Amino acid sequence: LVHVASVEKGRSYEDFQKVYNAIALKLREDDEYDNYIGYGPVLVRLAWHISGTWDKHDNTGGSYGGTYRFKKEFNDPSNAGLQNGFKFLEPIHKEFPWISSGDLFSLGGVTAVQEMQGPKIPWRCGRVDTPEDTTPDNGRLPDADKDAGYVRTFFQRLNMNDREVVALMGAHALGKTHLKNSGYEGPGGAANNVFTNEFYLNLLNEDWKLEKNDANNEQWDSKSGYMMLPTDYSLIQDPKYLSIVKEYANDQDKFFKDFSKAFEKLLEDGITFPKDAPSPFIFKTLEEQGL
Numbered sequence: 485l486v487h488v489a490s491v492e493k494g495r496s497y498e499d500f501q502k503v504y505n506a507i508a509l510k511l512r513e514d515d516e517y518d519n520y521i522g523y524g525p526v527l528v529r530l531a532w533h534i535s536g537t538w539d540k541h542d543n544t545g546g547s548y549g550g551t552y553r554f555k556k557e558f559n560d561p562s563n564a565g566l567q568n569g570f571k572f573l574e575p576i577h578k579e580f581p582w583i584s585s586g587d588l589f590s591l592g593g594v595t596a597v598q599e600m601q602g603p604k605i606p607w608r609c610g611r612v613d614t615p616e617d618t619t620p621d622n623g624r625l626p627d628a629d630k631d632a633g634y635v636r637t638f639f640q641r642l643n644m645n646d647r648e649v650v651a652l653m654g655a656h657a658l659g660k661t662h663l664k665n666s667g668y669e670g671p672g673g674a675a676n677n678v679f680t681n682e683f684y685l686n687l688l689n690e691d692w693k694l695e696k697n698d699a700n701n702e703q704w705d706s707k708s709g710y711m712m713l714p715t716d717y718s719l720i721q722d723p724k725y726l727s728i729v730k731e732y733a734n735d736q737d738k739f740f741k742d743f744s745k746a747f748e749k750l751l752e753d754g755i756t757f758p759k760d761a762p763s764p765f766i767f768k769t770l771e772e773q774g775l
């Protein structure tokens with residue numbers, strides 16, 4: 485399967501910076517969502533789940549085709565709760581009907597991270613919508629109730645290595661688990677709509693307790709009111725993972741730099757970019773624009 489990036493006709497940096505600003509302006513406006521967390525965390529989760537279907541072996545799945553717009557992927561049990569990120573973006577797609585679905589879902593994730601004061605993420609245009617029959621089947625996204633060997637093995641399919649996996653998981657400092665979506669409940673920290681390295685700090689400094697929640701699932705709970713998933717706590721159980729966790733709890737700039745590279749790579753897996761294709765765009769935030 486080859487998927488070649490095709491820039492939307494005649495579009496350039498300024499067009500996509502207009503779509504960025506539209507998403508970012510609505511993130512500021514619709515602030516009440518999920519008890520004032522706002523839409524940013526569900527939008528970086530949506531960009532991860534449309535990319536996380538990729539399989540390196542046959543180049544199926546991935547962010548290129550925008551296939552989450554089809555019922556099979558929209559109704560995947562693993563995507564429960566992401567309909568709220570879709571409905572947030574649907575106004576903006578009506579306003580810029582020329583951007584492809586893959587591009588709009590991935591730029592929403594980029595915009596949310598930078599607007600929640602994360603690192604800049606280089607983003608590239610050119611994903612092309614593909615037919616309903618290209619939609620990957622349910623079951624390619626990871627279970628939460630498993631251990632470190634499962635996480636390592638699952639992420640080899642998206643060929644991410646240990647460092648990349650640990651840098652990507654730092655995004656679980658954002659938002660929260662919702663019992664009616666996943667059977668898990670609670671936030672992982674106090675700053676859950678500002679991008680920081682707090683996931684790593686909480687993992688190493690809190691007093692975790694294995695408890696059973698109302699959906700009868702086990703999760704790691706702390707006195708402070710935070711929770712960690714079994715696959716999250718996995719990172720301090722494995723010796724290779726645990727020493728990268730310590731590296732990111734001791735250096736927030738290295739965390740930001742490595743997250744930026746692994747999230748771009750995540751979003752680009754499966755796509756062939758021609759050598760005459762434009763460079764990756766670095767978008768300015770509303771704040772850097774005085775907007």
Ligand code: HEM
Pocket residue numbers: 525526528529532564565626627628629635652653655656658659660661662663665666667668713715747
């Ligand atoms: C083995 C890996 C992973 C598993 C099992 C997993 C699982 C989960 C689960 C069960 C939730 C709760 C969903 C809900 O109830 O609403 C969640 C939320 C979230 N995850 Fe993951 N995740 C994984 C990796 C990642 C990665 C790599 C990213 C992003 C780079 C990510 C970003 C998020 C975000 C931002 C949320 C919060 C959503 C919200 O607030 O609504 N996840 N994760």
